Design a binder for this molecule. Structure first.
Ligand SMILES: Cc1cc2nc3c(=O)[nH]c(=O)nc-3n(C[C@H](O)[C@H](O)[C@H](O)COP(=O)(O)O)c2cc1C
Ligand SMILES: Cc1cc2nc3c(=O)[nH]c(=O)nc-3n(C[C@H](O)[C@H](O)[C@H](O)COP(=O)(O)O)c2cc1C
Ligand SMILES: C=Cc1c(C(=O)O)[nH]c(=O)[nH]c1=O
Ligand SMILES: C=Cc1c(C(=O)O)[nH]c(=O)[nH]c1=O
Lengths: 313, 313
C-alpha cells in the first residue's frame, strides 16, 4: 500500500506538508520540516523586505482551532531565496516557496528573481492571493479584477508553472467566477484551497476580552472550525478546474480528515493549526492513519479514490 | 433577577428566540415556539407561493454543527400573514415574520400586504438577504448594488421599521461597505448576523458520500463551526451601525455562548442548530445559564455588558 505521488515533475513520498506560515519561518523551522516525515514543505509567505509582523498575542489555539493575525512576519525574500538556492536538500523532499507581496509590483519583482532558481533547483512557487490580516489590504482574491491583474503580471514576469493559495468562498457564483479566472492562466498548475477563514472573532468569557491584540481581536480561523469549508472549496475547484491540481488545506488533524480532502479531489494535503499544536510528529501519525483507512477499504493508491466523493441520486 | 428588554417598541422577557427556519414552518411549530420560554419567535422565511423545497436528505447534524440545503420549503406567505394577523397570541411574546422572495418584485409584493398587519398587530419584518441554498440565486447581500436596490424598493413599499438577516462576511472592506449600505436606510432598525456559513461540504468517510442530496452535497453551515464567524460579524456591525440594533445568530448552545454574543453587541440572540437538536426546552436552560454567569460576574442587566467586549491595549 502506497502513499507515493508523482506530480508537477517531482516525486513525493506522501501527500503531507505544512501549510504556509506554520513551522517554516526560519532556517531552523525549515530544517525541522525537512527532517520530518512530510512529503514536502513550503516556506513562510515572504515580502521583499523583512517584517516583524503584528504585536503579540497574535496567534491563539483552542480545542476547535486557531485564530491568527500574524501580520506577515518573515525574514524577507532574500532569505527564502537563498534557502531555496543554497541551503535546501532537494534529495530529502521537494520545496515550495510562498510569496505574498503587498502589491502586484512587489510580487512581480520577487518572481523575476525566483525564476532562475526555480529553473535551476526545481523550487515551486505558491503565490498567496489571500492574506486576510493586513489592514487596508482585503484579500486580493476577493476582487476578481485585481486577481486577474496579479495573475497576468506574474505569469508574464515569471513564465514558469506556479500555484496559487486561495481564500475560502461561500457562494456558488464566486466559485464559478474564481475558477474561470484561474482557468485563463495556463501556468497556474495548482490551486491551494484554503487560506484561513478571514476575520473571525474569538472572545474569552472569563476576561470578557478578545484573545489576540491586532485588529481589535479579528483574525483568520483555522482548524476544526473550517473543515467543511475547506472540503467545499477543494471539491468546487476540483470540479471547476479539470486541467489543474488542487492541494487541500484546512481542518486536517487525522488521516480521516486527509482522506476526506483526497476524496474531495486533493493532491497534496497541507496541515496548519494541527501542526502548530502537535509538532512535526503529526506527519508519521497522519501517514499511519491514512494507510489504515486505505487498507480497510482495499485502496492501494491515492489515485484510486482521489476526487471520487459520491453525491446522492 | 429577570432579563428584560424594550426594543423596537416591544417588550421582551429575555433576549432568546429561534433562528428563522427552525421550529417555525407550520402552525404547530409556531404554537410550540409560542409556548416555549423564548423571549420571541420568528416565522420560516416565506415566498409568495408555497414551496416543497429541495429533495431529502436536506439537513444533517453532527457534534460540531449542521449542514442544510432545505431549499426554502414553506407554507407560503398567505399562511404566515394569517398566522400573524389572526392566530398569534401577542400577549405571550412578539413575533417576527421572515420574508425571502426570489426577486425584488416578489419581496415588494409581500411587504405591501404585510404593512397593514404590522400596523395593526405589531408583527416585525425580518427581510432575508442571505439565502445560500437556491440554485441560481446567490446570496443578495454579497452583491452590494442588488442589496441597495432591495432595501430602496422595500423601504418605499413598506414604509415601516424592519430588519435584515445578513450573510456572514470575512473581509474588513466588505464589512465597511455592507454597513455603509445598511446605514443609507433609516427604516432598517435591526441587523441579524448571521445566516449560515454558505456552501460547506460534509463528507461521510465510511460511505465516501456527501450527506445531503441537493447541490451535490453543498449547504449552509450552522452550529459550533460558526461561532467565531458569528461573533465577528455581530461585533463588526455593532461597531459600524451605532444607530441600529444587532441581533446575534450563530453557534449558540449555552448561556455562555449567548453571553459572548451580547458582549460582542447582540440585543436579541437567536438559536438555530442547537434548537433543532435539543428542542424548545433549550430556552429554559439558556436563560438559567445566562443568569448564572451574570450573577457570578455581578451584572444585573444586559445593558451593563452589551457591546463591552474588551480589546487588548
Ligand atoms: C500562524 C499562522 C500563520 C500562517 N501564515 C500563512 C502564510 O504565511 N501564508 C499563507 O498562505 N497562509 C498562512 N496561514 C494559513 C494556513 O496556511 C492555512 O491556510 C490555514 O491555517 C488553514 O489550515 P488549518 O485549518 O490546517 O490551519 C497561516 C496560518 C497560521 C495559523
Ligand atoms: C434547517 C434550517 C433552516 C433554516 N431556514 C432559514 C430560513 O428560512 N431563514 C433564514 O433567515 N435562516 C434560516 N436558517 C439559518 C438560521 O436562521 C441561522 O442563521 C443559522 O442556522 C446559523 O445559526 P446556528 O449556528 O444557531 O444554526 C436555517 C437554518 C437551518 C439549520
Ligand atoms: C501571508 C499572511 C498570512 C498570515 C499572516 O502572516 O498574518 N496569516 C494567515 O492565516 N494567512 C496568511 O496568508
Ligand atoms: C431562507 C432560506 C434559507 C434556508 C433554506 O430554506 O434552505 N437555509 C438556510 O440556512 N438559510 C436560509 O436563509
Amino acid at each position: 500500500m502506497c502513499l507515493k505521488l508523482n506530480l508537477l515533475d517531482h516525486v513525493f513520498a506522501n501527500p503531507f506538508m505544512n501549510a504556509a506560515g506554520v513551522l517554516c519561518s526560519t532556517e531552523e523551522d525549515l530544517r525541522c520540516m525537512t527532517a520530518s516525515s512530510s512529503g514536502a514543505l513550503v516556506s513562510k509567505s515572504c515580502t521583499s523586505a523583512p517584517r516583524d509582523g503584528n504585536p503579540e498575542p497574535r496567534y491563539m489555539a483552542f480545542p476547535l482551532g486557531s485564530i491568527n493575525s500574524m501580520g506577515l512576519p518573515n525574514l524577507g525574500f532574500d532569505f527564502y531565496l537563498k534557502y531555496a538556492s543554497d541551503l535546501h536538500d532537494y534529495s530529502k523532499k521537494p520545496l515550495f516557496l510562498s510569496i505574498s507581496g503587498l502589491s502586484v509590483e512587489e510580487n512581480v519583482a520577487m518572481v523575476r528573481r525566483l525564476a532562475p532558481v526555480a529553473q535551476e533547483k526545481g523550487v515551486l512557487l505558491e503565490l498567496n492571493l489571500s492574506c486576510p490580516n493586513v489592514p487596508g489590504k482585503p484579500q486580493v482574491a476577493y476582487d476578481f479584477e485585481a486577481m486577474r491583474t496579479y495573475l497576468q503580471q506574474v505569469s508574464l514576469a515569471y513564465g514558469l508553472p506556479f500555484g496559487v493559495k486561495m481564500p475560502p468562498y461561500f457562494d456558488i457564483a464566486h466559485f464559478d467566477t474564481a475558477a474561470a479566472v484561474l482557468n485563463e492562466f495556463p501556468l497556474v498548475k495548482f490551486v491551494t484551497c484554503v487560506n484561513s477563514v478571514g476575520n473571525g472573532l474569538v472572545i474569552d468569557a472569563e476576561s470578557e476580552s478578545v484573545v489576540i491584540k491586532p485588529k481589535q481581536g479579528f483574525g483568520g480561523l483555522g482548524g476544526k472550525y473550517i473543515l467543511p469549508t475547506a472540503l467545499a472549496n477543494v471539491n468546487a475547484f476540483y470540479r471547476r478546474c479539470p486541467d489543474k491540481l488542487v492541494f487541500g488545506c484546512g481542518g486536517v488533524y487525522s488521516g480521516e480528515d486527509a482522506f476526506l480532502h483526497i476524496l474531495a479531489g486533493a493532491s497534496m494535503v497541507q496541515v496548519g493549526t494541527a501542526l502548530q499544536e502537535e509538532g512535526p510528529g503529526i506527519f508519521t501519525r497522519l501517514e499511519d492513519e491514512l494507510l489504515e483507512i486505505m487498507a480497510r477499504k482495499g485502496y492501494r493508491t491515492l489515485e484510486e479514490f482521489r476526487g471520487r466523493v459520491k453525491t446522492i441520486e
